From TrEMBL:
Residue ranges the record marks as coiled coil: none
Name of this chain's protein: Lysozyme-like chitinolytic enzyme
Keyword Hydrolase among record annotations: yes
Organism ancestry: Bacteria, Pseudomonadati, Pseudomonadota, Betaproteobacteria, Burkholderiales
Portion of the full-length sequence here: 102 to 252 of 252
Gene Ontology annotations of biological process type: carbohydrate metabolic process
Gene Ontology CC: one annotated term: extracellular region
Keyword Isomerase: no
Record keywords, A-Z: Hydrolase, Signal
GO molecular function: carbohydrate binding; hydrolase activity, hydrolyzing O-glycosyl compounds
Length: 153
């Protein structure tokens, strides 16, 4: 505990481990972030073709990135740079950590990361796509555990 999952590209592992270090999570957060990135962008390979392609590795929506800019700068010591893949991961990590702490659990953190705080079945994203936040949380939590995750909170 813990090892890089074989299927996670080594550049991505570095980003998530840097994020893990910033929150003192012993490598466990990095496993969760790996699962999130696999689902959101497939490490960057599943982006092309999508209206939300430009939102990067963790697919944080523009209005959501905008709300967290000052907090990002405070946490990481530099202004958010969307062209930086490490910053993309740092931003997604900050928001997911915030949700997990605020709502009280990983599952709920994942659900509200994907759906927002006021998700309901039939809610749509900034591109008008239906958000299956419950299914997202289920499948990302399973992937997290499959990578060797060991927490619920
Ligand atoms: C390349 C590709 O297409 N990949 C797919 C992913 O894009 C995809 O899921 C999308 O993921 C993002 C991030 O998790 C998710 O974004 C959330 O969107 C909601 C709804 O807009 C947000 O909330 C609102 O925020 C505003 C401003 O703060 C609030 O005023 C408002 O109240 C909120 N609304 C509600 C209802 O609470 C979240 O902030 C936002 N999260 C983030 C981190 O930005 C999209 O909704 C996801 N879209 C879909 C259709 O799921 C993934 C889905 O499984 O699939 C990839 O393949």
């Amino acid at each position: 505990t813990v090892t890089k999952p074989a299927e996670v590209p080594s550049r991505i592992w570095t980003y998530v481990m840097n994020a893990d270090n910033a929150y003192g999570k012993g490598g466990d957060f990095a496993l969760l972030l790996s699962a999130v990135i696999k689902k959101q962008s497939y490490f960057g390979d599943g982006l092309s073709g999508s209206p939300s392609a430009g939102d990067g590795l963790m697919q944080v929506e523009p209005n959501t990135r905008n709300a967290y800019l000052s907090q990002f700068s405070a946490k990481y010591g530099h202004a958010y740079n969307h062209s930086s893949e490490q910053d993309q991961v740092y931003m997604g990590s900050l928001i997911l950590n915030e949700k997990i702490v605020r709502f009280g659990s990983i599952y709920s953190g994942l659900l509200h990361y994907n759906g927002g705080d006021y998700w309901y079945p039939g809610a749509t994203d900034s591109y008008g796509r239906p958000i299956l936040a419950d299914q997202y949380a289920n499948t990302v939590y399973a992937q997290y555990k499959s990578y060797g995750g060991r927490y619920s909170r």
